Short mmCIF file of C-alpha atoms (C1' of nucleotides) in Angstrom, two decimals:
data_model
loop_
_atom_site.label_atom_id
_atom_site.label_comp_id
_atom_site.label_asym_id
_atom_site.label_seq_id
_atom_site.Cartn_x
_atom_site.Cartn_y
_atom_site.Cartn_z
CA UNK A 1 -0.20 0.83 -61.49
CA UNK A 2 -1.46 3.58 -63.96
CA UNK A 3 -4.47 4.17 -62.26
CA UNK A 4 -2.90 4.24 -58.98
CA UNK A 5 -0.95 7.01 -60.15
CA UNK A 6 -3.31 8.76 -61.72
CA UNK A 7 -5.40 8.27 -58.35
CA UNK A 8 -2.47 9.24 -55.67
CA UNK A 9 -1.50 12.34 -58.43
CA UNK A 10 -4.70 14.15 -58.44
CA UNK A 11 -5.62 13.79 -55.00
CA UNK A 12 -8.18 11.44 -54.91
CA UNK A 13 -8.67 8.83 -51.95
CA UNK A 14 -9.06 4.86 -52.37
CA UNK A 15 -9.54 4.67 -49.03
CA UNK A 16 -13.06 2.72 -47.76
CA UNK A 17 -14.42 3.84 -44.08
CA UNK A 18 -13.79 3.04 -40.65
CA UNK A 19 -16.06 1.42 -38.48
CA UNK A 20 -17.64 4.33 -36.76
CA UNK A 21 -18.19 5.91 -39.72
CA UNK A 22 -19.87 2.76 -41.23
CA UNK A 23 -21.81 1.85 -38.41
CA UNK A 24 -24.04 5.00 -38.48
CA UNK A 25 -25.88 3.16 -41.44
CA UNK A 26 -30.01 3.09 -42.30
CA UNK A 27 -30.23 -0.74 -41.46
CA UNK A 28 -31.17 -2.18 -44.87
CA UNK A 29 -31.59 -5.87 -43.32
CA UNK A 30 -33.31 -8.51 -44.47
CA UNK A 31 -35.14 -8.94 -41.67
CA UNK A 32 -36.02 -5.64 -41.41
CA UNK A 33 -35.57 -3.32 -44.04
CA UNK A 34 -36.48 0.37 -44.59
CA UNK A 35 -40.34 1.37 -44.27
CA UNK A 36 -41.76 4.80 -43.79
CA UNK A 37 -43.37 5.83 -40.26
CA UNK A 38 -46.62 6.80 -40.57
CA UNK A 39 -46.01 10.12 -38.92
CA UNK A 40 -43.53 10.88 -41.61
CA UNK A 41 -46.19 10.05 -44.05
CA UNK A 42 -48.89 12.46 -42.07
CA UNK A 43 -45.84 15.06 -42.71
CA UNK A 44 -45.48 14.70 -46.05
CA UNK A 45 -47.62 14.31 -48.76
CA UNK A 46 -47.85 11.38 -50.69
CA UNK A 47 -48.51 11.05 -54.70
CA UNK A 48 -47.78 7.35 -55.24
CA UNK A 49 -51.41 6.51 -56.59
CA UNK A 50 -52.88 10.21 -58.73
CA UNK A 51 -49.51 10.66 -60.72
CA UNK A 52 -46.89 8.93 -62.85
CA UNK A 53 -43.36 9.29 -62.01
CA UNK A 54 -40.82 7.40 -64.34
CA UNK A 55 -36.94 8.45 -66.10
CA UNK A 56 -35.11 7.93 -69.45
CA UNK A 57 -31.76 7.19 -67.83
CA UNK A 58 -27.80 6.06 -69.49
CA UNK A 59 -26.82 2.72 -69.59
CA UNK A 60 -25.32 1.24 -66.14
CA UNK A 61 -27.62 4.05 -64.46
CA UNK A 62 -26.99 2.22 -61.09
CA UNK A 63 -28.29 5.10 -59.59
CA UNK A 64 -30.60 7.49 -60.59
CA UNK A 65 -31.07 11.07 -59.82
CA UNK A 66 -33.15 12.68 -62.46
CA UNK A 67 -37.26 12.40 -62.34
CA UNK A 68 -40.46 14.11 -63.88
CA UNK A 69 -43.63 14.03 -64.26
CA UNK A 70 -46.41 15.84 -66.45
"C1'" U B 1 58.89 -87.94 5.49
"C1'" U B 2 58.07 -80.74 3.27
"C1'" U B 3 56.51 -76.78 9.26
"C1'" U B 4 55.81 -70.84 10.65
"C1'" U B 5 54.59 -65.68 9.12
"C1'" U B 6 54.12 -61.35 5.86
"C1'" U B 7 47.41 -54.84 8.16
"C1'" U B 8 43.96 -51.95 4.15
"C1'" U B 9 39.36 -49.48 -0.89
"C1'" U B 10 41.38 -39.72 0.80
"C1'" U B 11 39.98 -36.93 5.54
"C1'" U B 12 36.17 -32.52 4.87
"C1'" U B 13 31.50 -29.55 3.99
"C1'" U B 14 25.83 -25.79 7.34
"C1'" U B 15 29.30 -20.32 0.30
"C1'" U B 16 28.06 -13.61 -0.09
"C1'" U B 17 26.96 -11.05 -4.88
"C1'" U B 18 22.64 -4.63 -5.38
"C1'" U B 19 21.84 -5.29 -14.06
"C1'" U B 20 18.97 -4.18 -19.20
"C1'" U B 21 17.42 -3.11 -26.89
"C1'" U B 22 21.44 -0.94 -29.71
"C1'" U B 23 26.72 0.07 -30.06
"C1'" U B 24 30.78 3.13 -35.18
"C1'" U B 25 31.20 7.07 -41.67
"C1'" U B 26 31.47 7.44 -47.81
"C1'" C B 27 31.30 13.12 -51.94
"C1'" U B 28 29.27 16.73 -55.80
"C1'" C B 29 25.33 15.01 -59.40
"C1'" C B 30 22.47 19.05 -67.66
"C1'" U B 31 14.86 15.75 -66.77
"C1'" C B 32 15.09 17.68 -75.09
"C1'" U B 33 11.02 21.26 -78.06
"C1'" U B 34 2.90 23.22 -81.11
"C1'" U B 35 1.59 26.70 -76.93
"C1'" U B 36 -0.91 30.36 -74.36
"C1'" U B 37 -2.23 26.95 -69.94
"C1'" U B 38 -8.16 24.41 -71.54
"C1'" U B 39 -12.46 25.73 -68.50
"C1'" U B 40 -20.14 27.34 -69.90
"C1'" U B 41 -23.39 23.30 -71.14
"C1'" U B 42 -26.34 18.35 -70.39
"C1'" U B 43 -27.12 13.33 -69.69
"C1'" U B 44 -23.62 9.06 -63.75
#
RNA sequence: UUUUUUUUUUUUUUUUUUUUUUUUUUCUCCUCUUUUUUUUUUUU
């Protein structure tokens, strides 16, 4: 009940989405999960192989943003 | 040696109809105390 206050008080939604705003999802499927297309790899250019990229990162980091590399 | 007569289960069937959830009261009301209100910054 606290945090429901403290929620609803400073105007923060609980709410999760609607199916239309779901649905317009990158289809991470088992049977067919995400992999690049090769044009998009033409496009860009890739570093995976000449350069190490790793993070420091807090405990629970679920999800990082922060990367470099020297 | 004991004849003859004294009715019985109401008659009737071939009548029209154009509405609609509910329903109807109760008054004005003293929020107590360190504050201006803090604020960059970075790791989610």
């Amino acid at each position: 009940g606290e945090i429901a206050t403290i929620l609803v008080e400073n105007s923060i939604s609980v709410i999760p989405f609607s199916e239309a705003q779901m649905c317009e999802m990158p289809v991470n499927t088992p049977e067919s999960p995400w992999k690049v297309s090769p044009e998009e790899e033409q496009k860009r250019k890739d570093l995976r192989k000449s350069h190490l990229v790793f993070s420091i990162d807090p405990k629970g980091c679920e999800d990082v943003n922060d990367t470099l590399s020297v």
